[PDB]
């Protein structure tokens, strides 16, 4: 614990969706899987994760936070390998804190790939999670919630972390699928209040971290936490000005109001596994007692070159990733345009313009920045009603407020 009332350097990431290389042979089965993984660089999760941690190390980061979805599909092996990397990070002096996401625990979808077959592989239980990641928040927690993997951590004397587990997994094996939506019981909400009171007694500011979102981040369920108003009210009552969440994967900042009018800013950092692969820098000013959040794009090309890599996709990662993610949204739209009988009145060239607009607006929405003008926009505006159309339109306008920078008030 950092007792000195000095500036604190922090980094937050989320949705690493780590997949242990030992769980795949990069065969047919794996290729199809990654193809349907809508944009996530699953094939390079090991390199992306290492590149990221190398950055944390060079920054000599005080605190590293990971807001859920540590693994692809809760594979025990992926969890163990990721834990090994975090153990090394801690040897450098950096304190690491993690919480689970919807894909991390009791995951019936845990699979390993061999040729044209997906085979079963072990997942983990809730207590397995607190055991595997005991060094990263759990063992030294100041307080731990009774029925969730939530806990209160004190990495320094002036700044504490309210690490929340908003994941729902206790009925996963019975469902056959990992629950996507998130939520907090009244008991965990009561614990949050007690925790907030303890931080206040100790003169510490508190940063609430959760996988699911505190409020909506797109005008177009299961991503914003269930019954979010109760959570917002609980956090604002604790005097917390901002929260760090993930799950939706898009670099996106939005504010919400408590029932009594207090504001809290929900900062969603880009999924580490998806374009543009940004992570968040958070700096605490001891003198001003405020927090400054600034996103940073992971430089894979620089890491690749320093590794002496011969993989062209990594040496040219910017282009590779740009194309990979653009095509994911392009194909997404084109499939619909080529299936719905309400679009056959559009000629091929137009469907292409529309697919292009989706690929552009979509990728820039994930980057959290303004999308460039595209000929497909006019076509979408007059196109038939649909969720897709709503999304394309809702992401056609420039962000009215930065999704990359925030300073607490
Ligand atoms: Ca530790
Ligand atoms: Fe998630
Ligand atoms: Mn995720």
TrEMBL record:
<dbReference type="InterPro" id="IPR050884">
    <property type="entry name" value="CNP_phosphodiesterase-III"/>
</dbReference>
<keyword id="KW-0732">Signal</keyword>
<feature type="domain" description="Cyclic nucleotide phosphodiesterase C-terminal">
    <location>
        <begin position="299"/>
        <end position="394"/>
    </location>
</feature>
<feature type="binding site">
    <location>
        <position position="69"/>
    </location>
    <ligand>
        <name>Mn(2+)</name>
    </ligand>
</feature>
<feature type="binding site">
    <location>
        <position position="102"/>
    </location>
    <ligand>
        <name>Fe(3+)</name>
    </ligand>
</feature>
<dbReference type="InterPro" id="IPR012365">
    <property type="entry name" value="Pesteras_lmo2642"/>
</dbReference>
<comment type="similarity">
    <text>Belongs to the cyclic nucleotide phosphodiesterase class-III family.</text>
</comment>
<dbReference type="InterPro" id="IPR004843">
    <property type="entry name" value="Calcineurin-like_PHP"/>
</dbReference>
<feature type="binding site">
    <location>
        <position position="211"/>
    </location>
    <ligand>
        <name>Fe(3+)</name>
    </ligand>
</feature>
<feature type="binding site">
    <location>
        <position position="15"/>
    </location>
    <ligand>
        <name>Mn(2+)</name>
    </ligand>
</feature>
<keyword id="KW-0408">Iron</keyword>
<feature type="binding site">
    <location>
        <position position="247"/>
    </location>
    <ligand>
        <name>Fe(3+)</name>
    </ligand>
</feature>
<feature type="binding site">
    <location>
        <position position="135"/>
    </location>
    <ligand>
        <name>Ca(2+)</name>
    </ligand>
</feature>
<dbReference type="InterPro" id="IPR029052">
    <property type="entry name" value="Metallo-depent_PP-like"/>
</dbReference>
<feature type="binding site">
    <location>
        <position position="69"/>
    </location>
    <ligand>
        <name>Fe(3+)</name>
    </ligand>
</feature>
<keyword id="KW-0378">Hydrolase</keyword>
<keyword id="KW-0106">Calcium</keyword>
<feature type="binding site">
    <location>
        <position position="249"/>
    </location>
    <ligand>
        <name>Mn(2+)</name>
    </ligand>
</feature>
<dbReference type="GO" id="GO:0016787">
    <property type="term" value="F:hydrolase activity"/>
</dbReference>
<dbReference type="GO" id="GO:0046872">
    <property type="term" value="F:metal ion binding"/>
</dbReference>
<protein>
    <submittedName>
        <fullName>Lmo2642 protein</fullName>
    </submittedName>
</protein>
<feature type="binding site">
    <location>
        <position position="17"/>
    </location>
    <ligand>
        <name>Mn(2+)</name>
    </ligand>
</feature>
<dbReference type="Pfam" id="PF17839">
    <property type="entry name" value="CNP_C_terminal"/>
</dbReference>
<feature type="binding site">
    <location>
        <position position="15"/>
    </location>
    <ligand>
        <name>Fe(3+)</name>
    </ligand>
</feature>
<dbReference type="InterPro" id="IPR040869">
    <property type="entry name" value="CNP_C"/>
</dbReference>
<keyword id="KW-0479">Metal-binding</keyword>
<feature type="binding site">
    <location>
        <position position="90"/>
    </location>
    <ligand>
        <name>Ca(2+)</name>
    </ligand>
</feature>
<feature type="domain" description="Calcineurin-like phosphoesterase">
    <location>
        <begin position="11"/>
        <end position="250"/>
    </location>
</feature>
<dbReference type="Pfam" id="PF00149">
    <property type="entry name" value="Metallophos"/>
</dbReference>
